[PDB]
């Protein structure tokens, strides 16, 4: 069994959630392996940036999520850590790695994500966001 870690973001413009479409066409949020040298909170950042083209700002940490996942027969433990962002500058645009980047009002991110850790991490960042007036 192999291990991984990452760190992506859950951010909000204007009431609007930041939401990626992966390669197998499911909408989930920004975020990257956590490489040598970086703390989780700069992978976040810098993967959200790379691969939506939008910069944000961590106002706290949300939570971490976990799965287990296989690829051409191995199996993998995933461990994601997710930080609540807030809309600094840029405009969605896909990385080379997701098919699209795009914001959505609450109400249609919710029927969009598909992943049970999406929707747990989701109900905690607008829980906490009502904190920063976000
Ligand atoms: N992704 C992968 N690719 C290829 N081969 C793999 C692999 N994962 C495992 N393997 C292979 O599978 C084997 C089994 O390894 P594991 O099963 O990974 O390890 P252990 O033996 O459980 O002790 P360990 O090192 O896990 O615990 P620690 O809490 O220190 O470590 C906690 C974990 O957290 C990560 N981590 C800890 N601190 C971190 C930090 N500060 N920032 C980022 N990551 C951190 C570490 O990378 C560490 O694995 C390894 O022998 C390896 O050969
Ligand atoms: N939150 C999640 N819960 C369960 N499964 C997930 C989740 N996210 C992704 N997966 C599934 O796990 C596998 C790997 O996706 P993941 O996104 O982790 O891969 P990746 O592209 O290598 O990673 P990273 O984006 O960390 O660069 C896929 O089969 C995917 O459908």
Redesign the pocket.
Same mark, same amino acid.
């Given at each position: 069994m192999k291990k =991984?870690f $990452?760190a992506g973001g859950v951010l909000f413009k204007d009431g609007e959630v930041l939401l990626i479409k992966?390669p $197998?066409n &499911?909408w $989930?949020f920004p %975020?990257?392996?956590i490489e040598p040298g970086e703390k989780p909170e700069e992978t976040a950042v810098r993967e959200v940036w790379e691969e939506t083209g939008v910069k944000g700002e961590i106002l706290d940490y949300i939570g971490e999520?976990h /799965?287990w996942?296989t690829?051409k027969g191995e199996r993998i433990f %995933?461990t &994601?850590k997710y930080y609540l962002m807030k809309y600094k500058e840029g405009e969605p645009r896909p990385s080379w =790695?997701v098919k699209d980047a795009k914001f959505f009002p609450i109400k249609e991110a919710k029927k969009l994500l598909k /992943?049970?850790?999406?929707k747990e991490i989701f109900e905690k960042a607008l829980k906490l966001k009502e904190k920063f007036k976000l």
């Open positions: =991984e $990452s992966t $197998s &499911v $989930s %975020k990257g392996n999520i /799965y996942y690829l %995933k &994601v =790695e /992943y049970k850790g999406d």
